[PDB]
Amino acid sequence: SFSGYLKLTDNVYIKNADIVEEAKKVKPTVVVNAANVYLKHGGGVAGALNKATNNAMQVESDDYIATNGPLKVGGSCVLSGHNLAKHCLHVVGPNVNKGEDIQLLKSAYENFNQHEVLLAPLLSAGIFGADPIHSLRVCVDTVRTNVYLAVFDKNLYDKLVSSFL
């Protein structure tokens, strides 16, 4: 199971970890991807998860988009977890750098409630441009299922824990 996490609340845990390494170690039922509406896994968490699957995530994602069209910002889809997890829940948080509504971050986190336990990154953090302290707050106030957050950056992890109310 999950090890080395700091408990923030009844259901939210956090660790300074590379989510790819964490997924390969735990092989959780669900790993969350910080997806975009096109499921183009170029960079950030998505680029790293996809690279760990040897591009199989991108091949599966392109077939999903060809059939279904793009996701909505705030939406998600369940696809294979490949070698990382049983499933990957691709969740689209708003990208502040694309001028997307930050209010959609709560809708994005609501997708996590359909899964009992998830390994996840902070939505809309990193290259998505939102404040990770705000993302953690929305996470704790929205997600009711068990979420194990992996924060890659040690300095950000320390800031998130030390400022957690």
Ligand X SMILES: COc1ccc(C)cc1NC(=O)Nn1cnnc1
DSSP state for residue 55 in the 8-state scheme = T
Pick the binder of ligand X from 4, 21, 25, 27 (CB under 6 A).
27
Give min distance, CB of 88 to ligand X, in A: 10
Q: How far is CA 112 from the centre of its chain?
A: 9
Pick the binder of ligand X from 2, 6, 29, 38 (CB under 6 A).
29
By CB under 6 A, is residue 25 in contact with ligand X? no
Pick the binder of ligand X from 16, 17, 28, 90 (CB under 6 A).
28
CB 27 within 8 A of CB 16: no
CB 17 within 8 A of CB 151: yes
Nearer to ligand X by Cβ, of 2 and 164: the residue is 2
Alpha-helical segments (H) within 117-165: 132-142, 154-162
Residues that bind ligand X (CB under 6 A): 27-29, 81, 85-86
